[PDB]
Amino acid sequence: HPEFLKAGKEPGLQIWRVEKFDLVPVPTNLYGDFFTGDAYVILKTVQLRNGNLQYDLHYWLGNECSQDESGAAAIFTVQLDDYLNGRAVQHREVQGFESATFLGYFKSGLKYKKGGVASGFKHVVEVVVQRLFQVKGRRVVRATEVPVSWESFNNGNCFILDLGNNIHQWCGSNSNRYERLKATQVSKGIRDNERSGRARVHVSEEGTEPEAMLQVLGPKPALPAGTEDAANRKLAKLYKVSNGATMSVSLVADENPFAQGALKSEDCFILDHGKDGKIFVWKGKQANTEERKAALKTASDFITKMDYPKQTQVSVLPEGGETPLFKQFFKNWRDPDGLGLSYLSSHIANVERVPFDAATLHTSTAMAAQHGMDDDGTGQKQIWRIEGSNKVPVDPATYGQFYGGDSYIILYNYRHGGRQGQIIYNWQGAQSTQDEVAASAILTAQLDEELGGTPVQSRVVQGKEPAHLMSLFGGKPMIIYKGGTSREGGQTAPASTRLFQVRANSAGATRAVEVLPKAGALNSNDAFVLKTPSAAYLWVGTGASEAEKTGAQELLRVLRAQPVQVAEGSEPDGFWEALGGKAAYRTSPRLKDKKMDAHPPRLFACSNIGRFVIEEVPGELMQEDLATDDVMLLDTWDQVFVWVGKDSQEEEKTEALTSAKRYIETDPANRDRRTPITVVKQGFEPPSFVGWFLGWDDDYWSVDPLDRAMAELAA
Amino acid sequence: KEPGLQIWRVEKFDLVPVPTNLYGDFFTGDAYVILKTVQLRNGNLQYDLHYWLGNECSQDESGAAAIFTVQLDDYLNGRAVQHREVQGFESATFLGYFKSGLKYKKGGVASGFKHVVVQRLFQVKGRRVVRATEVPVSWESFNNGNCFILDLGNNIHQWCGSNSNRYERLKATQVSKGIRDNERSGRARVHVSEEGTEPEAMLQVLGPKPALPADAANRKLAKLYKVSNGGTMSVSLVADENPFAQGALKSEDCFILDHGKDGKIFVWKGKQANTEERKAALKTASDFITKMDYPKQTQVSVLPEGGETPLFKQFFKNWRDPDQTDGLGLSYLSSHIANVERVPFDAATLHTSTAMAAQHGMDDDGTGQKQIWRIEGSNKVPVDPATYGQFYGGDSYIILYNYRHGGRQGQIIYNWQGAQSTQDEVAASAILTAQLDEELGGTPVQSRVVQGKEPAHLMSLFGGKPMIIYKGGTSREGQTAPASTRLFQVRANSAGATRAVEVLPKAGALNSNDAFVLKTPSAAYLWVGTGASEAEKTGAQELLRVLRAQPVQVAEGSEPDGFWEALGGKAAYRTSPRLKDKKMDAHPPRLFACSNRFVIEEVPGELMQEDLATDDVMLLDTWDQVFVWVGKDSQEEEKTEALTSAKRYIETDPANRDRRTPITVVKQGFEPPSFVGWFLGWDDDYWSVDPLDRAMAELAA
Structure with missing residues (x-):
């Protein structure tokens, strides 16, 4: 087709209206207007950090669309994808039920007009x-x-x-x-x-x-x-399709954390999510072109076959160009192989990456966001241990040490820009008794209120410490003991042989986490520390670096031992006696600065009839979208912010933590239940929240947003 | 208990609330119990328990109130600081609660009058x-x-x-x-x-x-006794002379710090003193007042170990609470600065926050236009601008600085007095300083500095180059030779800037917080203590570029042994960490009026511009510096003794302050930012209307 040669040559948005089996360009000043009696084809082109071009191919069906007009649109989609060499991701969009990706293309909104080609109407x-x-x-x-x-x-x-x-x-x-x-x-x-x-x-x-x-x-x-x-939306199934060349399907996995290797390059699969409105079709690299080119008809037969609404969203994905929301249905998905990954989400393609540099941190909200650091961690702080129903101050000599039978509260004073704020970290130990974690949560809420309702509130549970919490102790590591307590009452005797994983963060801070001393609790990219009655080892991985070692070293200074350095794969044997064997550990490196590509942020609104619903906010993140009568969630991967609008209902305000948790438990990715939650108040957002919003304005709420609009570009 | 202030009147062995809008009315025939609750930045609650005794009060309700205060100190877990207040003689802390003054009414419960x-x-x-x-x-x-x-x-x-x-x-x-x-x-x-x-x-x-x-210059000397049997009380002197050793306070005993010549006595209760003796701390203190024949109105404070007030602590040389460098705040938070928001230093934003300027001593970034003269004989001699930032301890200098903060400009005259300058020359710099002031309109700030105690803002005046301060010698030209081995201390301020001060090359002159430099005949070290950050050692680097020697970086504890011998051994030095951010907590800023016999009177409560009386000379004592604010209608003698008045305030202080403390004279209407920033609610146009003319108009009728 002649239009195929004009297509996907620069980054941008192209829209064609299907007009008696031809593609006809919509005038650009009219993108977002759609005729209900017509069908369209939309091509979104994203630049890929490494200069390559990535394609999202949608077709959109109006409600008064003829059945030949929709068929023409689907034919053009298969054939445009083919001109771009199958590299593209395809989307079938029905009016009023379009996908979040599509909706993000249209900042001013969508307009559905009466008429169409058959009735002689035009964009002109x-x-x-x-x-x-x-x-x-x-x-x-x-x-x-x-x-x-x-x-x-x-x-x-x-x-x-x-x-x-x-x-x-x-x-x-x-x-x-x-x-x-x-x-x-x-x-x-x-x-x-x-x-x-x-x-x-x-x-x-x-x-x-x-x-x-x-x-x-x-x-x-x-x-x-x-x-x-509702929030069913956690479960999904996976099928293998057959006879794209009249269709029959075979169940290939029935629960949801999926084995990547069930995706055999020679077939086509269907990831079923119909009860949350989505189905995916996965195309194997070596599937025969008869089945690859019937992917969408396959998808609709499968929608008929299970009696899902005809409005159900359909995507088809080529092997190797999969999207993060498809990839997240699978256990430990990893690419077999540059800058960026398979897919670069459109709404974050414009974001300039900012590496960490501790000198300029107080100047960059983007660095604070991308690295989860509100400041260098050197401000004033107070640390308490819960004992019954009271906060008991921690021995200041031991600041940085945390016992896993305890619960702590940390009040911390941060400065960034020229602005002060506070954070109340509530660290909940893994063997803290339930009466004490609860008291620690209530004591955290009261402290927040006693200080004017403005401090950020962050619940962390042992093992999933946020990056900023590690940087609070000078250069000393956060040390996290498996159990026991530092209360004056019941000192215990520590275990015979103990093992400490010592991971570092974007900033050079370390944390020393006690893990069970089995060989399989080891990770290639960190330093570790074993202690037997006999000897005291300092193991260091191929991927370990120096601040992991400097960190693991002063852990032994605290444990009153002296090291015996050991490199990976070159271990003495009294060592792997001390673990009850040898097994295989985690060797695959960490995403580090690719985490934002793999797991881009997402903004949802959330509500509680007695049922919990969430509705995702499409497009680039904009302060404008933070409705002051709403409670919103910003899902980084490492953490979930809960943003509380000033004028939200008080039943929703005091449920903020529970809404984040209910969101995390219903996630189809099977998210770590320990994932930190961080509640944040309208007008007191910390840098690591605002950094994600290009165009944050500090006086934005000083004039009412509606009163501004009905004037600022009005008269 | 939330925060706030609560007053009860003791009515027939009962605690009866005073209507809150009548707080400050006290019946002369009654006794009252007053609980002030303060919030501590970490959220915690701090208690000040006063009972107050009217002149016409029976010995029985006066005893009822004393029972109620010890028993209420019980309900609050022995944590409160307690006070006995007598009509007409109440503590500063107490009077700071009552903004519109106190009212002493005729009558009491016995005559049948209520609020x-x-x-x-x-x-x-x-x-x-x-x-x-x-x-x-x-x-x-x-x-x-x-x-x-x-x-x-x-x-x-x-x-x-x-x-x-x-x-x-x-x-x-x-x-x-x-x-x-x-x-x-x-x-x-x-x-x-x-x-x-x-x-x-x-x-x-x-x-x-x-x-x-x-009626003053008395308040300087105190004593410290050990208390037994508070039965029949016996005491024993444990220190006789002002600066007291913290160690003398033992946790098993009770002590009485005796400041009776200045109208106050303290009772300190240790954690491990027996419980009867602690509940009797009020009675103990009274008998001590009898035994010493002190007036019955002498104020009484009782403190618990670990919650001592900053006045108490200042009778001891280098009080150090065992734990706190960490945590927010300290032992006690003085009620009057309890509302003060804490700005950390940030040079980009300094020109906007007078609160930042006050809280760190920085009127501006230190980069405005400056002239520096050296004193030879009786004249000012312009110093070589290329040598700016270097000062010799046998000279005295004058430094005229142009500061801009907010939208407005002002100027500061620094008068640096070297520790080995000749008496005639240093005295002449002071006469010349005041003359440069009279010649520039009488409006600049005048600040007197002594070598070795340079204020933060002065050591920020020289780009990023440190202030270097050689012990002797003279920039005038007859320059003589440097000592063979010289030890330099390099301290930083909260603004990053640094100052290099030559000291005697010894061991007790090292300081864990600071970078040092030691030039022996042989080599050249750059000893960097545990507590020294990277502005301290980037300070010590261009001191190595000026001494034209080259370094051998040494960290603390791990020093080559030729280092310790170009010193003469290894003796004991100071390891203490300095308060820095919590300075404001240990030494809150106090405001005083003075009259020169030299008398001083403290001004209680939140610092308020209204308290700056145009016909007065007032002292604002931050700790690193004494401001003297000179009222535009005070008398000329008072105006011209402003320096010596401040100097007498400092010699007479019970803290044994450093005689080298900087003194900063300030004129009404021309106050620098680091002065106005302590008065939340400052108004520039305040004196544009006579304060009594305003108040008798729109405030009242």
């Missing part, structure tokens, strides 16, 4: 206009063209009466303030993109309609009320 | 501590130096003597206004007047007006 920028859009949606904004009549309105939503030179935006009496804010975007969209600027926008609500409005629609009658999932 | 048709008369005395005493309704109560209030209920009549002072009339109006707002819930009019303008209402009740009427 002399405007005699009389449309009406019903605007709905909170994070994803959709304006649906509707009949121009009061019977189309309701007190819940915002409506737009487009009269050409004047655009009338009208807000329901029950329209929420933030919804009103999203609707102003579609209006300026009409003003700036369709009218090239020369048009004026008018805002009103019930009982304030201008005469222009009342002329077109008539006297206003009385209006009814608006009408707006 | 709950009015015709009383109050006499108002006092300038920093305003006390209003209820007096008989009659011209016989009046005099011409004080202010009086004739409370007629719906009308309140403030009357000012002709010889009363303008700032006293100011404090009287806070009393009047208080009565209006608190006792009459806003619904009353205050009527001010003087002699001859008495309204008819006043002359109707008082009749026709007849013709009317109109």
Whole structure:
């Protein structure tokens, strides 16, 4: 096709409308307008850090779309992918049920217009206009063209009466303030993109309609009320498809942590997630082109076969160009092989990576975010141990040591930019008795309130310490003992033979974590420390580095022993006697600075009818999307931030921790239950949260966001 | 207990709450218990338990109140600092709770009067501590130096003597206004007047007006006794002379720090003293007051081991709490700085936060225009700009600095006095300093520095190059030869900048916190202690570039043995870590008025611009520096003794302060940022209206 040669040559967005089995370019100033009676093809091109080009191929089906118009669109998708050499990821998008990736392409929102080719309508920028859009949606904004009549309105939503030179935006009496804010975007969209600027926008609500409005629609009658999932979404299954060349499927894994090696390069599989709205088709590199080219028809037969809604999202992925959300259904997925990985998520492609440099940290929110460090860790701090129902100050000589039968609270003073903040780390030991971890959690909440509700609150449980917590002790390592307690009452005797993994972080800080002394608790990239009655070893891995060694060295200074250095694979035998054998340890290195590519951040909104629902926020992360009446989650991989809007309900405010946990337990990746949670208050966000938002503004909430909008680009 | 302040009146062996809007009214016939609760930055609660005794108080409710305070100190786990307060003689801490002064009312429980048709008369005395005493309704109560209030209920009549002072009339109006707002819930009019303008209402009740009427340098020496049997109490002197050894306080005993010549005695309870003896600390202290024939009003503080107040601790040489370099704060947090937000130093943002400037002694980044002269004979000689930042200890210099902070510029004259300069030359620099000041409008700040105790902001004036301070010799030209082996100490400030001070090359002159440099005939070391960061050793590097020698970097504890011999051995030095950030906690800033016999009076409570009296000379004692604020209408003698007044404040201090402490003279209307930044609520236009003219207008009526 002639358009295939214009396609995917630069990074960007291309949209073609399927027009009697031809691809016809949509005018760029009109991207995001779609005709309900038509089908389209969308190609998104991402630059790949290493200069290569990556392709997301969508087709979009309108509700009034003909069955030949949708078939043409699917044919073009298979054949465009083929022109780009199967390297692309494909998406089938149905109106109103589009995927998060697609929705992120459209910042001003989506508009669904009445008509299509069959009825003789076109995108063509002399405007005699009389449309009406019903605007709905909170994070994803959709304006649906509707009949121009009061019977189309309701007190819940915002409506737009487009009269050409004047655009009338009208807000329901029950329209929420933030919804009103999203609707102003579609209006300026009409003003700036369709009218090239020369048009004026008018805002009103019930009982304030201008005469222009009342002329077109008539006297206003009385209006009814608006009408707006669950958290099953953890389980998934996997099938092997057959006879792409009439379809039969074989179950290949029934629970969810999946064996990567069940993906045999000679076949095609279907990752089923239909109850959360998604199915994937995985194409083996050596599957026969008859089956590779029927992937989408395969997918729809499978959707019919299990009786899922026809709106279900479908993607097809080529072996080796898999997406993070596909890869996360599998145990320990790793690429067989540069900068960046398989897939670079579009919403984070624009982010410049910033390596760690401790001198300029106080200057970069991007460094603070990308490395999880609010400051060098050298500020003032206080450390307590819970004993019954009281905080008991820790012996300051032992700051940096933590016993796993205890629970601690650490109040820490951070400075970044020229700004002060506080963090309250609540560290919950693995054998801390349940009455004490609970008291430690309540004592943490009270301390936060006694200090004005502004300190960040971070729950950590032993073994999954956040990076910033390790950097609090000078250059000394955080030492984490398996059990026992430092309370004056019950000193214990430590174990016979003990083993300490000593890992380091982006900043050079170390933590020494006691693990069971078995050979299989070893990792290639860290230093370790064994202690027998006889001798005291300092083992060091091929991937270990010096600060792992400097760290493991002063651990032995505390354990009152003296080292015997040992390199990997070149071990004395009294050593691997001291573990009850030899087995195989973890050798595969760590993602380090590729963690952001493998697990990009994700922003969700979350709510509690007695059921927990989460709705993901598409696109680049923007402060604008932090609704002050909402509770949001920012899922880094290493940690989950919970951002509490000032005007959220107090039942949701005090559940913040539980919502994060319920989010983590229902994750289809089988997330570590110990993953740290960090609650953060609107107006007091720490650097390691704001760094992720290009365009954070510190006075943003000083003027109300809706009052700004209805003026700043209004008049 | 949350934070806040709670007052109960002791009524027939019972604790009865005082209505909170009447806090500050005390019946002269009653006794009261007062609990001040403060929050400690780490969230913890800190308790100050006072009981207060009116002059007309029975010995029985005065004993009831003492029972209630020891028993309430019980409920709070022996953690509170306790105080006995006697009418007219209350501690500074106590008086800082009552912003509008105290009121001493006639009556008590025995005569049947509570706090709950009015015709009383109050006499108002006092300038920093305003006390209003209820007096008989009659011209016989009046005099011409004080202010009086004739409370007629719906009308309140403030009357000012002709010889009363303008700032006293100011404090009287806070009393009047208080009565209006608190006792009459806003619904009353205050009527001010003087002699001859008495309204008819006043002359109707008082009749026709007849013709009317109109100690320091001791506080330095104290002693310390051991207490047994607090049965019949016996004591034993354990130290007789001011600076006390922390060790003398043993945990099994109780001690009485005796400052009776200055009106206070302390009781210190150890953790391991038996429990009867501790509950008797009030009674112990009283008998000690009897045995020594001290006035019955002598103030009494009882402290628990580990929660001692910073005044107490300053009677000891180098108090060091066993644990705290870590944690927020220390033993005690003085109530008046308990609201102060703590800025850490950040040079980009310094020009915005006067609070940062105060809290670290830095009026600006140290980079403005400067001129430096050296004193030869009786003249200033411009120093070689290429040698700026070097100072010889046989010279004295003057340094005129141009500072900008906020939107505004100001200037500081530093007068550096070398420790070996000749008396005539150092005295001449002081005369010349004050002359450079009079010539620049009288407005610059003048700061006197002695060699070896240089203030933080001065050692920030020289790019990133350190201040180098050689012990002897002279920049004038006759320069002589350096000593064969020389030891240098390199300290850093909170702004990163550093200062290199030559010391005697010995062992006790090492300091774990600092970089050092030692030039022997042979080699050249760069000993870097455990506590020294990277600005300390990048300081010590260009001192090696000026001495034109080359280094052999040595860390602490692990030193080649020719190092220790170019010293003459290895003796014991200081390992202590310095307070740095918690300095403000150990030594909170106090504000004083002085008059030169030399008398000083502390100003209680939160530091308030309002307390800076235009006809006064005031001392603001931060710890690293004494400010003397000079009121634009004080008398010329007071103005010209400002330096020597400060110098006398320092010699007479019980802390045995360092005689080399910097002194900084400051003029009303021209205060530097590192001074205004201690007064939250500072206003530049404050003096653009007479403070009494403002207050008698819109504040009152």
